[PDB]
C-alpha cells in the first residue's frame, strides 16, 4: 500500500525522483510510527 503509493508518485512526478530510498524508508518509518500513535490514541 505505502510501497504502491510511493511507486506511483515516483513514476509519475519528476520532482519526486530526487528522494533517495533512504529518505523513502525514513518517511515509511515516520508514517508507521504515526499510524501506531493514531491507533493507540483514538482508544484513549
Amino acid at each position: 500500500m505505502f510501497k504502491e503509493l510511493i511507486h506511483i508518485f515516483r513514476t509519475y512526478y519528476i520532482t519526486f525522483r530526487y528522494l533517495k530510498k533512504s529518505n523513502i524508508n525514513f518517511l515509511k518509518n515516520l508514517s508507521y510510527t504515526l499510524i501506531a500513535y493514531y491507533l493507540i490514541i483514538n482508544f484513549q
Binding site: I35, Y38, L39, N42
Partner: protein
C-alpha cells in the same frame, strides 16, 4: 517457507486497516445536521 500464525497476521492487518480507516474517515459516525431540515417533528 512456513509462516507461523499467518492467518492471525492477515486478520490483524485487516483489523488494523479497518480501524484506521474507521477513525480517519468517521464513515460510521456521520452527521445529520444536514438532514434535520428534511425530518419530521414529534411532540
Amino acid at each position: 517457507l512456513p509462516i507461523r500464525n499467518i492467518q492471525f497476521a492477515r486478520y490483524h492487518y485487516l483489523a488494523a486497516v479497518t480501524v484506521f480507516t474507521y477513525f480517519a474517515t468517521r464513515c460510521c459516525l456521520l452527521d445529520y445536521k444536514k438532514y434535520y431540515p428534511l425530518a419530521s417533528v414529534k411532540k
